[PDB]
Amino acid sequence: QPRRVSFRGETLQSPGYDPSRPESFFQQSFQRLSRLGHGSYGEVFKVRSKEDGRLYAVKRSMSPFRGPKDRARKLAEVGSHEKVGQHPCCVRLEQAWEEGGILYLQTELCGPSLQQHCEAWGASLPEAQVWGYLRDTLLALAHLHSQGLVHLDVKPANIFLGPRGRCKLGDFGLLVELGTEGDPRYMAPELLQGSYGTAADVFSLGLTILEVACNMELPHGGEGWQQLRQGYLPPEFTAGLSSELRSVLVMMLEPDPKLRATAEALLALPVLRQ
Amino acid sequence: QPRRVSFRGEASETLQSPGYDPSRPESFFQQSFQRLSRLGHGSYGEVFKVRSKEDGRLYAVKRSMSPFRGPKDRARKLAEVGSHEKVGQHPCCVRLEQAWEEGGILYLQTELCGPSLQQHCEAWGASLPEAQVWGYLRDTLLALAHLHSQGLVHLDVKPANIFLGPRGRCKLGDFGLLVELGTAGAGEVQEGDPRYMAPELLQGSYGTAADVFSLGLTILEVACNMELPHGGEGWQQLRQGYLPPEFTAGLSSELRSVLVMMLEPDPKLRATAEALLALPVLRQ
Amino acid sequence: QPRRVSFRGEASETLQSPGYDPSRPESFFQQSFQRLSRLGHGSYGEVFKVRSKEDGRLYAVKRSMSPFRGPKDRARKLAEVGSHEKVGQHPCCVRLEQAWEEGGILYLQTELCGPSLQQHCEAWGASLPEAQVWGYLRDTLLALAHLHSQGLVHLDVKPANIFLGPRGRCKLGDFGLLVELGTAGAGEVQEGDPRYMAPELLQGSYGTAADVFSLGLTILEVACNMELPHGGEGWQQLRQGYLPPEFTAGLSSELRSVLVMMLEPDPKLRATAEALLALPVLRQ
Amino acid sequence: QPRRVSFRGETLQSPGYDPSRPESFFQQSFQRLSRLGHGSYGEVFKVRSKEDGRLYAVKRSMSPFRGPKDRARKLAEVGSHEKVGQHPCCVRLEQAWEEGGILYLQTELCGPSLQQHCEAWGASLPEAQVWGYLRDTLLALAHLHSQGLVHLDVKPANIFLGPRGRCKLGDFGLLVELGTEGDPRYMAPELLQGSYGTAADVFSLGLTILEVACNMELPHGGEGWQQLRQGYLPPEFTAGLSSELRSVLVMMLEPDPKLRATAEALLALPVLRQ
Amino acid sequence: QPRRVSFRGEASETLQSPGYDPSRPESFFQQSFQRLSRLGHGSYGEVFKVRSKEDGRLYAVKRSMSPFRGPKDRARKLAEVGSHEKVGQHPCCVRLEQAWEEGGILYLQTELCGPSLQQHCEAWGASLPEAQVWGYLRDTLLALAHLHSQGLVHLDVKPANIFLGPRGRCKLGDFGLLVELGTAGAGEVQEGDPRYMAPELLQGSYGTAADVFSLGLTILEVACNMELPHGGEGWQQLRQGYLPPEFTAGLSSELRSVLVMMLEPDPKLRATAEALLALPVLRQ
Amino acid sequence: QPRRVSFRGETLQSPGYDPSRPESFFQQSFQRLSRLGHGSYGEVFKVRSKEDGRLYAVKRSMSPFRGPKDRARKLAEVGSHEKVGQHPCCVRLEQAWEEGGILYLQTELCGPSLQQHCEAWGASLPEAQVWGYLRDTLLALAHLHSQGLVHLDVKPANIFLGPRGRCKLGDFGLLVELGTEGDPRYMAPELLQGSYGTAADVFSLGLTILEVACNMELPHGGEGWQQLRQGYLPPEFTAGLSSELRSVLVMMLEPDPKLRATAEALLALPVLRQ
């Protein structure tokens, strides 16, 4: 039966929903409009709430909980998302629940990922658009880092467009509360030395941005991959970009964490206000 | 500098080849192979089609993206070699020539295989000759009978991890999740694929039978040209041994009939590779 | 028309006998056997004492009531053949001569056995010679040692599924629930008998030891001429290794003593057939 | 501890019952008078409620729940029984509960099964008695079928006499709600073709009745078994029966489901009113 | 009077020795051995250093405090003999010469071993030569490879149950909790030690890998001269594969590196003895 | 999350304790002052309640519940301790709870065990001290036996000094309610014959006392061990003891349970009042 899942400690009710009928709460409480993703995790659906008639995205897990490591891992993501709270540059969880060991996360409906969007574009992607996504994501970072949180998976796949283009940060499954693994492609190098902080996310975002700005897939290994983490920009990757944008990325990809700019620090720069 | 990675180890762990000079700054992989193409790229790193400068033969070499990111990462990467080795040579199992590390980077050199079943069957329509399927079925069953006889379970049987070999013979690959039954213990499989998972895994315990289901689904998927259910009702039905007519139709009663045996929800009633390979429709 | 059912299969699956003409409308079973008596009837169908017209020898043939009612039904029925075959020949295990199907009807032909222990001991009072028991004990232990050595577990050990053979030698039968450990995986046994079940089965996981308990109870039941508890307090006590005096009394300290070893609640401390058959009171 | 089991979504209380004492709720809340059955499932007891001093039958499961398939299967039977509701020709569940993974169903005390009763009789069983059992069971069927339910196990073992002989239908463990296996002896033939409906139960009842009317055990296989499912009455099985009764059974055993009479249709016939 | 206890049994169960006269009221143990010292005393009873009057050789004889206190007690005591026997002879496994009972008292005669690792390393400081450790590591790994090859799991691997042998060779002992995988079934280990327990045991199921973790911790403990966490945060960290710097430091990267492989939380990724003994640092 | 564990059938609250913080209830609700024991079971800590600022001892289990046999066995001890109730010669449980499958028992802080204390003494242990411990423990026994309870593990390890020396009986994990194993060293002989009662505990206490009085470790086997259970006092073990004390122990170590004195009977003797 449906149980609200929240770390702000719990039954659910809605129009369209009759506990005695066989169909699930999800099945009964929403119209399914499209499938926005699918893979290991399950499926993401475009849904209209029969409660309010508003659009949302719901994430359904594929199989029931396989055990505690599956359950714990799955439920961590809610705990995380909640700890983030409401921010206009961070994907918003309306509510979560389980029914038959299946986990559903109800969020604000976001548009495509930056990866999808920039892919659909050519390399003719306006540097304007980029700056917007940059500021927009730094704001998301600035918000998380100030709360003592590191996302650890900052990449175009995990960043979605809102209505009016404002880009928001999502997939908080790998988010950690400092004190209490991520994509090797966007991995910060301090991580290889067992050391991490908020800096990590800034590096990843540096690369998130370099990738979409250049419309060049980032190296999957070899010398290419090392160079970036020794703060070397390939001229192959720095053409068609404003001396302004390039200089910023240099400061985001500074190999020394202790020397790498902050989100707040970056959002202080003239090019990154308004 | 290049350390051989093997659990059948030897006091010959320094690596040598034609075209390789240690005093040159290039890596062994850069010096020792001609990269002819890239066959894959993802989280794991990259796979290249390469010519050996030593023996001039063609291979696949999987190179890991970053160095070892940590103890778990190192263990996970090395476990694949350990597994791949436990399998041994079988004509229906991807052969590993050798594995080595250099500055924390794991390289696996295997025989060069064609594309995965996923790719191959994607590339066919539902025009896929049911004949080819039986081939794939038999060829993978043989691989399993070989693994299962040796008390090994793969736990990642799927069209993605099944590659086409010399002529038509399809090879079972990606021994990342393979376990030796009795070593680990039948417990929760964390990093498994739920799309192909056997029902008994949801209750924690498993056996070889697990792989037979997974192959059931693997074959069903490619046989139908249908993507398998990613959750909800559809997904549970297959693990309660219901064949939703949308799939079962288009497939000879003969083929239809077998998959049933493979998809029996009860591991204890589910056919073995040994047993299935005894049926006439799957011999020679 | 008659298709042989075997998982040691062959390209000789069409069936032939003296007295069998394919062009006659009678079934192979009707044509090929003289039915001398009916030894059983229930849900499963029927068992007949029959003379082979081929070799004139006496057998038991179990014929299934209906055709295959569905995929589960077909699988369940065929799994018994598969199991019965995995057992092999042992003087203390019911021998299968052959299995076949015809219009969806499964027939199992075994050696002709006498009545089950249940029947035989029912028919005795508590006048049952304790001597006979040891025989049954030893004879069934041998059967288990044979199964367990081969990594097989029966999971349906009970006086109902134990039949008397040529002279006195009691045979273990009904391999319907038998599993190959490592194939299925130690998980919930759905269609088991709780009256003889080992405690460890309530916690999902099991081993060969399971059968030893079941035989513990099997022997206890017939040794006492007492029906075993069908639930409540009485039932839990046996699986917490308490011997309620109402049973333990009337049985030689020697016999009493052994059943204890067999009924140890902890599979990890419970005796093996191998080990028990080493004790002097159970040799030759 | 005792938990009410009901799909009409739950603690229990009674005289004789002290939560602090070791003995179970069942042990404490009833006197045990006889054992009415025993087998795979556990035991059925004749009980006097210490609450009301009224007679009931309680069904105790033998072992604790062996796992989810055991628990689910066991609990299905309650769900089923509830969905049936109160009918004078259907066995009545007072309440169900579990305590230490043991499942108890409390029903109205029924007399013996038709199988027991007709066995205890000879073949001298009045055709009168039969008609009563026939009408009585059709009523049970008529009630279930109108609610969209198929019993799937309609046989003399699963039909009990009430006080004043009125025969009631029981064992709803195999009952299914159309939309959302049975005895081969009483199995309808459409079932062999993957097709089922309410008709199934009518066929089974046709055979339930043929059996007790003839005091002949029904074929366990061979040609005997097939014939019936090709609508052939053996003259061995149709002697000593009224042309009336025989004709009815013909209509109940019509091999084509789409051609087989309904409970309502049958209860409309002159011989089957009063 | 003295009955030999063996599950490789024989029709020679009455016991005889030089210095033993049955008609004397003294026990066999009192008559047949010279007690030279007491090597242990606890709940179990007592262990003595003894000279055989038969063969004049030195042994350890463990004598049980009371007679058999009950069926569980008898079973528990006899299971150790049964296990100790299943192990067989291995130079790195404590050898049992014989076991016998007399008036309900179980005696186990083994080779005479030196002190346990616990004692030996207690008696050293952190001045313990890391060299000795590798020896102990390798020597115990060999013991496990021997057990694991034979489908046996010890489930009580710890410095207490590891004794020093002829010269330096450390021997694995106390086979009280040892189980034969497939006999019992992977289920809850009641009388286990949580201080050395592998994580997978908390989820009910296990394999040989269990012992490798336990040895991981065994070696970590003695390598550090640190007592292991008896609960709270500290205890869970080791079973989630975190090496709290307080331990990991002071140990060669080489040694540090290996323990990681042994302490991998995921049994399915955790190294085998076979595999570890292949690494150069652990050969000859 | 924290759940009160009691068989008097349950959330917990306290100062210092914030449900949202990561640290456990135990971690948050107490200061840890010393570790009083450690072994198989886990650890015993000297704690100051942040609630009341009073001293207690808490017993933490080492690993989460390993399964039902581990959980049941662990929880039995609470059930037991509760059934004992409040007595000045019996260790007092304030409360118990679990959090993350870890079990905590909160008791009155006791001083060292008799084993510890008498060990720390020589054999110069005043016979006075002994008598006090004897009476004090008989009172504990008298209380338990009158309630139909046998402790089954009566030894110097399981008996602690209170403030003002009054010795109290603890570790009720092996306590049984007559109707509804112990240390072989202090084992009563009837036990070897499958028979037990309240007498058992009296024998064990007879030996508990003999041991500390003599400052001699009790035989671990051989003839030594049998003799005591055939009511034979070794002169090695009866020197330096008052004819009074010796005679008492004879009556406590009477091999025949049916002939062995009671706690009440013993507490009736002149030497054992005040």
Ligand SMILES: Cc1ncc(-c2cc3cc(-c4c(C)ccc(O)c4C)cnc3[nH]2)cn1
């Ligand atoms: C073409 C196209 N493709 C995909 C999308 C899309 C994916 C998506 C995922 C979430 C989400 C959910 C649902 C749960 C947790 C969580 O962190 C997130 C980010 C929300 N909105 C989304 N929109 C839109 N358009």
Ligand SMILES: Cc1ncc(-c2cc3cc(-c4c(C)ccc(O)c4C)cnc3[nH]2)cn1
């Ligand atoms: C179009 C196309 N796409 C992909 C391929 C291809 C991928 C591939 C991977 C391995 C391999 C490696 C390299 C390491 C470990 C391991 O388990 C395996 C299976 C071997 N042969 C391969 N061929 C060919 N053609």
Ligand SMILES: Cc1ncc(-c2cc3cc(-c4c(C)ccc(O)c4C)cnc3[nH]2)cn1
């Ligand atoms: C009074 C009396 N009652 C019953 C018998 C009897 C039943 C019986 C069943 C089989 C058999 C069959 C036929 C198939 C599969 C299978 O596992 C088995 C054990 C073999 N021999 C039998 N003898 C004899 N006498």
Ligand SMILES: Cc1ncc(-c2cc3cc(-c4c(C)ccc(O)c4C)cnc3[nH]2)cn1
């Ligand atoms: C000689 C004799 N033998 C047996 C009986 C008898 C069996 C019986 C079973 C139920 C019952 C129960 C208890 C639970 C669920 C359920 O569907 C049912 C039908 C109710 N009343 C019964 N009476 C009477 N007389």
Ligand SMILES: Cc1ncc(-c2cc3cc(-c4c(C)ccc(O)c4C)cnc3[nH]2)cn1
């Ligand atoms: C200082 C000191 N302390 C302890 C010893 C010591 C204890 C010991 C126990 C056994 C033994 C026995 C006797 C029975 C069963 C069994 O598994 C074992 C391992 C064998 N050898 C031993 N040596 C030596 N020196």
Ligand SMILES: Cc1ncc(-c2cc3cc(-c4c(C)ccc(O)c4C)cnc3[nH]2)cn1
């Ligand atoms: C030197 C020294 N060492 C140890 C102690 C000491 C141990 C101890 C154990 C409990 C206790 C607990 C905590 C739980 C359940 C239970 O039955 C009991 C008896 C209470 N108080 C104690 N004090 C004092 N001084």
Ligand SMILES: [Cl-]
């Ligand atoms: Cl793959």
Ligand SMILES: [Cl-]
């Ligand atoms: Cl049977």
Ligand SMILES: [Cl-]
């Ligand atoms: Cl030990």
